[PDB]
């Protein structure tokens, strides 16, 4: 019976939580921004087209930077593109050809991808003879790798397919912390501005707040009705974003405790595969599988402008640190860049 | 300055070597012909790869043609994340225990999901129904019943196109025919000629299974080229 | 919050009508296609019956296919199963388990051992 007595304990504490949220919760951000002048109708033109992948894109990183830019597809390559040249800098040929994610350092010394192979495999792009090949390969999960991102040279924090976060340590190879709480399979993560703690969306409708120093959660975010596909940790590091399988993209708060806006349409009723902040955090801009990326000011829940051009269902989305553009990777295995 | 124009020159050099070394990786890449192995691990998944940790790649080579085929090991039961970077790929080699009957309604909505998801309407399945030689000594004995199993199994007729193998006799052909007819109705019932389902039967002896993958390949290419050109 | 309750599980005699009730909530109830699962003791969870979201495709197991009948009410946001008659071999806990995604024909990973969208279950118990 004390199976049955725990369980009611844990009901307990979840109406608890619901019920301090509920008295926290007195005015949503809709009535604070409806005061404020709505931003005018955006139109981002395609500037570059990248063109040399051979199959579906399943991810990409902006560079530091903000020229270079890496993006991974299943054809087995890792191709390292000059954003302002349209050249290739490294086409990196990959040992599994089945890769879902690709990570550029902050450094731009090191480019990470992994996928169904269930390993993080880290490339130097310094070598002293100049052709990038395997630094160091992390073996340590036991699900398909679906997010990595560098805190720095040293470290990576990489989210995989059973349900478990890792930190690794680059030089030795082995995770020093694991994340776990999930119970559904992690999708994406979101590094926050200070490398102190970090977001993850899995499938179970859940976001995760984990602390990277003590590796535990800090708090779950339930809002969502289905997989949380993408999250974006918003520009000054007190909110995050996430796109899910429900047609809607979901602003939570890391203070409050909960979720302020919800970013829905009745026209969109395809999943949400990638979401993204610009530098001022005003836009937030999302992929569909209706293979257009909408543009959502963050403070209002109308849509402002649409990002169209892709024959295939945007995978991956990104934009640089400046804000000048935005990179949208697709299963047509093109990118775009949009200023 | 001159050193800016340098830098340019080197850069483009290097992207005109990276692209050629991309042609020629393109022409490497569309040769090869990739197919997924799904099968349970009691299903005689293992028989088919004997023939020919995340991943595993097996390479065979039938009549000159290059053939990459991929069986997820390492992967979670729950399936519905990493089976769409299988869209792309030629065809599912779906392999399911015939005999074990409800390991056969599992199978059969596993191929429901797989057959109506909208990543995978393009994408063609071969179906195998493995361990005939048990399903048909099981049936022989009739110590388990298959219409226990499924009430329609009772009042079905063995259809007179079906060509039967002549050793068996006519009730074990029945049930093959029976259960090849589930999976047929799951294929049919929906796709307007973007994928078609290749059902096969196959024994653990039986060293036929590469050249039916083979001809179902051509099958599914020559269609879909057919189709492309508004002939079938 | 996504969370699925089961209720009107009990021991009952072979034969004997019975009915579970599943309310939902936390989710849009019309958008996604329900189902029903269960697992019985020493055994692996396995499907029972699903219904579509509007409620006129409706799927049964050949086990209990014309004994076990299905209805979901979605202004009520419920899903029904009526269980007219019993063999003891279904003495098994019954699921109420959503499909992953809405305005969806598959339904994935719905008999998954740590399927997310799954409901606690009701035990029920067919004895002499």
């Known amino acids: 019976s004390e199976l049955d007595q725990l369980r009611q304990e844990a009901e307990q504490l979840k109406n608890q939580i619901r019920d301090a949220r509920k008295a926290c919760a007195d005015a949503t951000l809709s009535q604070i921004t409806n005061n404020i002048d709505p931003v005018g109708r955006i139109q981002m033109r395609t500037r570059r087209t990248l063109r040399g992948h051979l199959a579906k894109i399943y991810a990409m990183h902006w560079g530091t930077d903000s020229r270079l830019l890496v993006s991974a597809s299943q054809d087995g390559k890792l191709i390292i593109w000059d954003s302002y040249t349209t050249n290739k800098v490294h086409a990196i040929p990959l040992r599994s050809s089945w890769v879902m994610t690709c990570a550029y350092a902050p450094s731009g010394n090191y480019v990470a991808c992994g996928g169904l192979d269930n390993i993080c495999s880290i490339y130097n792009l310094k070598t002293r003879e100049g052709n990038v090949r395997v630094s160091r390969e992390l073996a340590g999960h036991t699900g398909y790798l679906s997010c990595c991102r560098f805190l720095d040279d040293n470290q990576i924090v990489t989210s995989s397919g059973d349900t478990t976060c890792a930190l690794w340590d680059i030089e030795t190879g082995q995770q020093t912390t694991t994340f776990t709480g999930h119970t559904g399979d992690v999708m994406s993560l979101s590094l926050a501005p200070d490398t102190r703690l970090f977001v993850s969306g899995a499938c179970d409708a859940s976001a995760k707040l984990w602390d990277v120093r003590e590796g535990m959660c800090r708090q779950t975010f339930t809002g969502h009705e289905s997989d949380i596909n993408a999250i974006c940790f918003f520009p000054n590091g007190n909110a995050f974003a996430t796109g899910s399988d429900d047609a809607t993209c979901r602003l939570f708060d890391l203070r409050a405790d909960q979720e302020l806006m919800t970013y829905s349409h009745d026209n969109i009723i395809c999943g949400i595969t990638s979401v993204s902040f610009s530098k001022s955090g005003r836009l937030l801009l999302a992929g569909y599988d209706d293979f257009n990326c909408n543009v959502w000011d963050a403070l209002k829940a109308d849509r402002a402008g649409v990002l169209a051009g892709h024959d295939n269902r945007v995978s991956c989305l990104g934009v640089t640190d400046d804000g000048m553009a935005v990179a949208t990777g697709s299963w047509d295995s093109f990118l775009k860049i949009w200023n | 300055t001159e050193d800016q124009r340098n830098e340019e020159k080197a850069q483009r050099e290097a992207n005109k070597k990276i692209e050629k070394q991309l042609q020629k990786d393109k022409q490497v890449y569309r040769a090869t012909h990739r197919l997924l192995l799904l099968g349970a691990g009691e299903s005689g998944k293992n028989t088919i790869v004997k023939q020919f940790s995340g991943i595993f790649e097996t390479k065979f080579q039938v009549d000159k043609v290059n053939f990459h085929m991929f069986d997820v090991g390492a992967q979670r039961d729950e399936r519905r994340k990493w089976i769409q970077c299988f869209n792309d790929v030629t065809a599912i080699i779906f392999v399911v225990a015939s005999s074990s009957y409800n390991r056969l309604q599992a199978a059969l909505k596993l191929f429901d999901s797989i057959w109506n998801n909208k990543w995978l309407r393009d994408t063609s399945v071969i179906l195998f129904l493995n361990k005939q030689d048990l399903l048909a000594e099981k049936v022989l004995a009739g110590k388990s019943k298959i219409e226990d199993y499924f009430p329609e199994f009772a009042r079905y007729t063995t259809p007179e196109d079906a060509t039967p193998e002549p050793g068996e006799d006519p009730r074990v052909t029945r049930a093959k025919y029976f259960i090849r007819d589930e999976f047929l109705r799951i294929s049919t019932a929906s796709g307007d000629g973007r994928h078609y389902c290749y059902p096969h039967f196959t024994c653990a002896v039986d060293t036929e299974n590469i050249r039916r993958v083979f001809n179902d390949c051509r099958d599914i290419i020559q269609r879909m080229h057919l189709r492309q050109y508004e002939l079938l | 919050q996504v969370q699925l309750q089961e209720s009107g599980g009990g021991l009952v005699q072979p034969g004997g009508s019975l009915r579970l009730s599943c309310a939902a909530s936390?989710?849009?109830?019309?958008?996604?296609?329900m189902n029903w699962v269960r697992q019985a003791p020493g055994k692996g969870l396995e499907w029972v019956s699903d219904?579509?979201?509007?409620?006129?495709?409706?799927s049964y197991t050949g086990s209990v296919k014309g004994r076990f009948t299905i209805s979901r009410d979605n202004a009520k946001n419920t899903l029904y199963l009526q269980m007219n008659s019993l063999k003891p071999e279904d003495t098994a806990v019954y699921y109420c388990?959503?499909?992953?995604?809405?305005?969806?024909?598959?339904?994935?990973?719905?008999?998954?051992?740590?399927?997310?969208?799954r409901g606690q279950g009701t035990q029920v118990t067919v004895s002499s």
């Open positions: 388990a959503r499909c992953p995604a809405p305005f969806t024909r598959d339904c994935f990973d719905v008999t998954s051992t740590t399927y997310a969208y």
């Open positions: 936390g989710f849009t109830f019309s958008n996604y296609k």
């Open positions: 219904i579509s979201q509007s409620g006129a495709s409706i």
